[PDB]
């Protein structure tokens, strides 16, 4: 409908509206009018994406500032869902206003999801797709073909047609979801990737991952095209701290350094060949480096660095080269002795946990290498690779690795740590030493986002506690509130199972994963659930080796044979193509009434993004708490830094992370208040963690279900599914769970 919040005409694309949705819109408009940070959890079920999209389009069109809108999600599954909801909302707004207004909206992802080249489309890696698409379109190949038309080098017609048509005429006005965008670019023979990369400054909305905002290696080009005074929305912003961690984290193995030695030797051979043939490119590169010209001063806009900048752009050094790495051979020797120093550093029999300052002091006392030449390592290496004009870059990837490590550990000294450990897996017979350069402070990658932008929306369906995140990230909110979603009848039934059918306490600790009693209890409850679940299951466990051991044990003991009678069994696979095939197989088996059970990682690919609405999720079997591996040294480093700086207890953060992964798994089952589904939690340690739960989840959890065994939980589920199968009374839900236009107007008059 079309209603007013203050002076804002809101074109809601549904004939009805939830009350929680409208109070959410009131709070969001208050936040936008005030300006600043805000953390709000909007319960899953109720429409979240379309409501934000409606308020942002109303705010952008109506207000004379016309600030652009930034919408950051976690996966392009959710980005595509948002684009589809935006397509519906723009169709509604065009229908109501009678015209298609001036509006641009696109989603943003990698080349691998946006490559229409028929030859380079079967590659299993995005890196090889990027290196080929650069190789032909760095501009070196085009000018070579201009100079030599008989050259065997090839160009992508999809990119070359983009030069013919004007920038603003790449697409017609409106929204293009990735399916529609790929269909249009297939019809028009265009590259969608370069189109999206060129519409960043022109789109009213651009939707990209947290990687395209937090990780500077790809966000460096993105953030230069967006508006500083733009409204930013963080959707599903509950694992954004994890993304901030991996944005500034790094790992290297001894195979990587062996390939680094091989790449350094190949680079030495290549530079010897260049010095033999033509040293003029080396010469003018040398004088450009003497002049102090940086990489961006010499690299063209249509080409990218060979190794991307791993650090924040505000943390980069604006001064010239120190000159030690200015010559090509000098830089080659410099990087080779980097490789040998780090190789020497791996020969150790215990854990090394030292600060970057301690590492650089050990560096400067073992070799003569300073922080400042390392702070230009990636830039110098990328410039050298560009000026060498090497045809293949397959052998130089470990050079990217070592340049990234050098720049990352040089520029950064606080909030970071280096972990050198001899057994990368403790099950390996032969020692395989590892180094881990980790980012202790998760607030670093989100700090320039808060510095640049003014109005920030942080939102997850299941984020709890609300004040936990202003502690881990140094920012201040203007308001935090959690909504209790109201029901005519209780649509969701959460349980806690603490013991099996024989009242033996069940636990998912990794040391007791092979307990026959606990595994047998788990098999018993899943068999009974598969006997009583109508449509479909998703089942979450803590770890991948946990499914491997436990389904090996039930397949040995014949539980899964009995499961095969009722539902088709689907398991998450590390091959994400096979995992997506299993996912669509599961959805097909849920659609036709075949019945299916999905076994997944609670911290994995299926847990994020993928929603099990309606028949896709009816019972959410939570086997155990998805705790991380505590003995992993990186997690202990997390806990130590949080306790030292932000005064957060180790068990508190451990439990919080485990149950927030549990909660993001639980929130994928409800879409709409007509959707129903239970969230059963099978571990003895969930019983003490109700106070941490999401508030809409917490109000649905009764006192009687805090400690149940299998059988009365099964009876409660049976009664619940008999209850929600009944047709509800519209008079029971006419104005208390959903509002029409008249109910919303009446409540607006009551509030006034």
**Which residue positions form the known binding site for [4Fe-4S] cluster?**
115, 133, 156, 191
What does 159 interact with, of another protein, ligand SF4, none (CB < 5 to 8 A by kind)? ligand SF4
Which stretch in 262-270, 334-342, 473-481, 716-724 sits in contact with another protein by CB under 8 A?
A: 716-724
Token code pair at residue 239: 């694992």
Residue of 427, 387, 261 lying closest to 335 (CA atoms): 261
Least separation in angstroms between residue 68's CB and ligand SF4 is: 25
The yes or no reply on residue 115 touching ligand SF4 (CB under 6 A) is yes
Please count the residues of the chain.
752
How many Cβ atoms from other residues are within 10 Å of residue 559's Cβ?
A: 21
Beta carbon nearer to another protein, 346 or 724: 724
3-state SS, 37-51, equals EEEEECCCECCCHHH
Q: What is the CA radius of gyration of the chain?
A: 28
State the nearest-atom distance from the C-beta of 721 to another protein, in Å: 5
Residue 115: contacted member of another protein, ligand SF4, none (CB under 5 to 8 Å, by partner type): ligand SF4
Contacts of 569 (CB under 8 A, 6+ apart): 560, 563, 596, 597, 599
SS (H, E, C) 668-721: CCCECCCCCEEEEEECCCHHHCCCCCCHHHHHHCCCCCCCECHHHHHHHHHHHH
- How many residues sit in the footprint of another protein (CB under 8 A)? 23
Cβ atoms of 660 and 238 within 8 Å: the answer is yes
Query: Contact region for another protein (CB under 8 A) — 118-126, 420-428, 511-519, 528-536?
Result: 528-536
If one asks whether residue 668 binds ligand SF4 (CB under 6 A), the answer comes out as no
Binding residues: 42-49, 115, 133, 156, 191
- The interface partner of residue 156, options being another protein, ligand SF4, none and the CB cut-off 5 to 8 Å by kind, is ligand SF4
In angstroms, what is the minimal distance from the CB of 592 to another protein? 5
First to last CA, the chain: 20
Stretch that binds another protein, among 186-194, 464-472, 514-522, 565-573 (CB under 8 A): 565-573
Shortest spacing between CB 256 and ligand SF4, in angstroms: 27
When CB distances are held under 5 to 8 angstroms depending on the partner's kind, the choice from ligand SF4, another protein, none that residue 591 binds is another protein
Q: What angle do CA 267, 272, 276 make, to 5 degrees?
A: 145
Instruction: Report the candidate in 540, 539, 674, 535 with the shortest Cα–Cα distance to residue 618.
Output: 535
Residue of 125, 722, 751, 752 that binds another protein (CB under 8 A): 722
Residue of 133, 402, 563, 679 interacting with ligand SF4 (CB under 6 A): 133
Min dist CB 494 to another protein, Å, is: 18
Token pair of 547, please?
Answer: 């499914």
Closest CA to 155 of 209, 125, 194: 194
Nearest to 83 by CA among 105, 100, 55: 105
713-744 core/surface letters (b: 16 or more CB in 10 A; e: else): bbebbeebbeebeeeeeeeebebebbbeeebb
Burial 427-442 (b: 16+ CB within 10 A, else e): eeeeeebbbbbbbbbb
Distances (CA, A) of 130 to 28, 77, 202, 304, 382: 39, 21, 24, 10, 15
By CB under 6 A, tell whether 195 contacts ligand SF4. no
- Whether cis (ω within 30° of 0) applies to the bond prior to 465 is yes
Q: Which of 121, 330, 593, 736 binds another protein (CB under 8 A)?
A: 593
Of 48, 111, 513, 673, the one binding ligand SF4 by CB under 6 A: 111
Which residue from 11, 52, 106, 156 is in contact with ligand SF4, where contact means CB under 6 A? 156
Distance from C-alpha of 160 to C-alpha of 346, rounded to nearest angstrom: 47
Residue 594 in the binding site for another protein (CB under 8 A): yes
Structure tokens of 521? 């209890």
Rounded to whole angstroms, the Cα distance separating 170 from 167 reads 6
- Contact flag: residue 117 with ligand SF4 (CB under 6 A): yes
Residue 15 interacting with another protein (CB under 8 A): no
| CB of 557 vs another protein, minimal distance in Å | 22
Figure out which of the listed residues 81, 104, 159, 638 binds ligand SF4, where binding follows CB under 6 A. 159
Site for another protein in 572-591 (CB under 8 A): 590-591
402 binds, among another protein, ligand SF4, none (CB under 5 to 8 A by kind): none
Q: How far is the CB of 469 from ligand SF4 (least distance, A)?
A: 36
Among 92, 176, 178, 193, binds ligand SF4 (CB under 6 A): 193
Using rule CB under 8 A, residue 620 touches another protein? no
**Under the criterion CB under 6 A, does residue 114 sit at the interface with ligand SF4?**
yes
* Cα separation, 481 vs 658, whole angstroms: 22
Q: How far is the CB of 485 from another protein (least distance, A)?
A: 22
As a whole number of angstroms, the distance between CA 518 and CA 142 comes to: 64
Q: How many residues bind ligand SF4 (CB under 6 A)?
A: 13
Residues that bind another protein (CB under 8 A): 531-535, 565-567, 590-595, 614-615, 721-722, 724-727, 729
Residues that bind ligand SF4 (CB under 6 A): 111, 114-117, 120, 133, 137, 156, 158-159, 191, 193
């Amino acid at each position: 409908m079309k209603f007013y919040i203050d002076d804002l005409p809101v074109l809601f694309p549904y004939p009805k509206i939830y009350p929680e949705q409208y109070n959410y819109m009131c709070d969001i408009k208050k936040t936008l009018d005030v300006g600043g940070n805000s953390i709000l959890e909007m319960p899953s079920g109720t429409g979240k994406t379309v409501s934000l999209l409606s308020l942002t389009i109303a705010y952008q069109m109506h207000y004379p500032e016309h600030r652009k809108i930034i919408y950051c999600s976690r996966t392009m599954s959710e980005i595509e869902k948002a684009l589809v909801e935006l397509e519906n909302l723009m169709d509604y707004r065009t229908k109501e206003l009678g015209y298609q207004e001036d509006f641009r909206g696109l989603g943003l992802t990698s080349r691998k999801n946006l490559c229409l080249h028929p030859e380079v489309s079967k590659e299993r890696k995005g890196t090889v797709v990027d290196e080929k698409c650069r190789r032909m379109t760095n501009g070196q190949a085009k000018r070579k073909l201009e100079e030599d038309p008989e050259a065997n080098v090839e160009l992508c017609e999809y990119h070359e047609n983009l030069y013919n048509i004007e920038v603003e005429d790449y697409l017609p006005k409106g929204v293009f979801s990735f399916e529609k965008l790929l269909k249009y670019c297939e019809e028009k023979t265009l590259c969608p990737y370069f189109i999206v990369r060129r519409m960043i400054s022109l789109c009213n909305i651009i939707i990209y991952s947290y990687h395209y905002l937090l990780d500077p290696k790809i966000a460096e080009r993105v953030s230069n095209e967006v508006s500083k005074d733009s409204i930013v929305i963080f959707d599903e912003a509950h694992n954004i701290d994890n993304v901030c961690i991996e944005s500034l984290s790094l790992d290297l193995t001894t195979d990587a350094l062996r390939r680094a030695t091989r790449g350094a030797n190949a680079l030495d051979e290549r530079i010897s060949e260049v010095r033999k043939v033509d040293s003029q490119k080396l010469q003018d590169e040398y004088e450009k480096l003497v002049q102090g010209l940086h990489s961006a001063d010499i690299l063209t806009d249509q080409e990218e660095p060979f190794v991307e900048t791993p650090v924040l752009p505000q943390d980069l050094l604006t001064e010239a080269i120190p000159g030690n790495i200015r010559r090509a051979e000098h830089f080659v020797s410099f990087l080779k002795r980097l490789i040998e120093y780090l190789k020497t550093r791996m020969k150790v029999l215990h854990v090394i946990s030292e600060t970057p300052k301690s590492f650089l002091q050990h560096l400067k006392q073992l070799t003569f290498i300073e922080r400042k030449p390392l702070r230009f390592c990636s830039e110098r290496l990328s410039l050298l690779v560009r000026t060498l004009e090497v045809t293949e870059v397959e052998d130089f990837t470990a050079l990217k690795d070592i340049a990234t490590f050098a720049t990352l550990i040089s520029t950064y000294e606080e909030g970071f740590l280096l972990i050198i450990e001899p057994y990368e897996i403790e099950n390996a017979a032969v020692p395989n030493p590892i180094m881990r350069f980790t980012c202790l402070d998760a607030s670093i990658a989100i700090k320039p986002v808060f510095e640049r932008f003014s109005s920030v929306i942080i939102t997850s369906g299941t984020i709890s506690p609300l004040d936990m995140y202003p502690r881990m990230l140094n920012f201040k909110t203007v308001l935090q509130k959690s909504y209790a979603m109201t029901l005519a009848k209780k649509s969701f039934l959460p349980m806690i199972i603490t013991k099996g059918s024989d009242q033996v306490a069940i636990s998912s600790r990794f040391e007791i994963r092979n307990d026959p009693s606990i595994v047998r209890n788990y098999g018993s409850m899943l068999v009974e659930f598969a006997k009583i679940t109508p449509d479909g299951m998703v089942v979450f466990f803590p770890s991948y080796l946990y499914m491997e051991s436990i389904v090996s044990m039930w397949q040995t003991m014949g539980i899964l044979d009995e499961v095969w009678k009722h539902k088709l069994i689907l398991v998450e696979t590390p091959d994400a193509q096979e995992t997506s095939l299993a996912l669509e197989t599961y959805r097909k088996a849920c659609s036709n009434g075949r019945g299916a059970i999905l076994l997944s990682v609670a911290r994995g690919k299926v847990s994020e993004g993928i929603d099990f609405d309606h028949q896709y999720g009816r019972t959410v079997l939570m086997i155990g708490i998805p705790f991380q591996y505590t003995e992993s040294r990186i997690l202990k480093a997390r806990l130590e830094f949080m306790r030292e700086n932000y005064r957060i207890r180790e068990n508190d953060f451990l439990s919080f992370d485990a149950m927030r992964h549990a909660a993001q798994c639980l929130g994928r089952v409800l879409r709409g208040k007509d959707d129903y589904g239970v969230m059963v939690l099978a571990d003895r340690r969930f019983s003490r963690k109700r106070s941490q739960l999401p508030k809409w989840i917490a109000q649905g959890l009764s006192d009687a279900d805090l400690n149940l065994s299998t059988d009365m939980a099964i009876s409660n589920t049976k009664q619940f599914l008999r209850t929600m199968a009944q047709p509800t009374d519209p008079k029971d839900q006419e104005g208390v769970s959903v509002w029409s236009y008249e109910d919303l107007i009446k409540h607006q008059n009551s509030r006034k």
